[PDB]
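Please think about what follows:
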Amino acid sequence: AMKLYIYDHSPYSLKARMIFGLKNIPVELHVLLNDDAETPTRMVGQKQVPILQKDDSRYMPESMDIVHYVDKLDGKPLLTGKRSPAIEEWLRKVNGYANKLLLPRFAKSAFDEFSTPAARKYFVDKKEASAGNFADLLAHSDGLIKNISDDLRALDKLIVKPNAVNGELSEDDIQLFPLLRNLTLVAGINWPSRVADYRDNMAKQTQINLLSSMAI
């Protein structure tokens, strides 16, 4: 009877979703409108998402707390591999700018949490620094796309396996995949073959759709 309250686009929700998919544990997704402060506050006392409702019907926020709690539910935790400092550095870098590519694309996209005009507007009112700034960021796609492409060629030589970035499923797979999955929203990226393998493989494994059809 486990429910998971999420936003489709958010990495933090995706991290929670991965652990259910990877362990083949059935979960009832409930996407909440981006502007909804009242419902998550009933559940956990604050506007926080993702939220997990366990079988006892009690609520629990925080992505990593949820991942750790779920990995444990069947007595066979899967996230046993080592973390790579080379992967953590790469993540640190790309996260310094990926949102310059994603946030504007998010706002324009077909996600449930934006299904209402006011829900979509809130996201923009919360994330867009100045009134037309997303339009200016989109206009600098050319530059950012080169930047991301180059980085993916560096991530390419680092990926040991298509089913575990380090060779054994680890926290790096939790931190990496959401980023990669969401970057498939960005039209024009050049994807190297091993990164591509990993992206496709890890999507079938986590039971999470990729965004290529909505790419802009």
Summary: Residues 141-156 form the longest helix (16 residues). Residues 9-86 form a domain with the Glutaredoxin fold (CATH 3.40.30.10). The chain has ten helices and four strands.
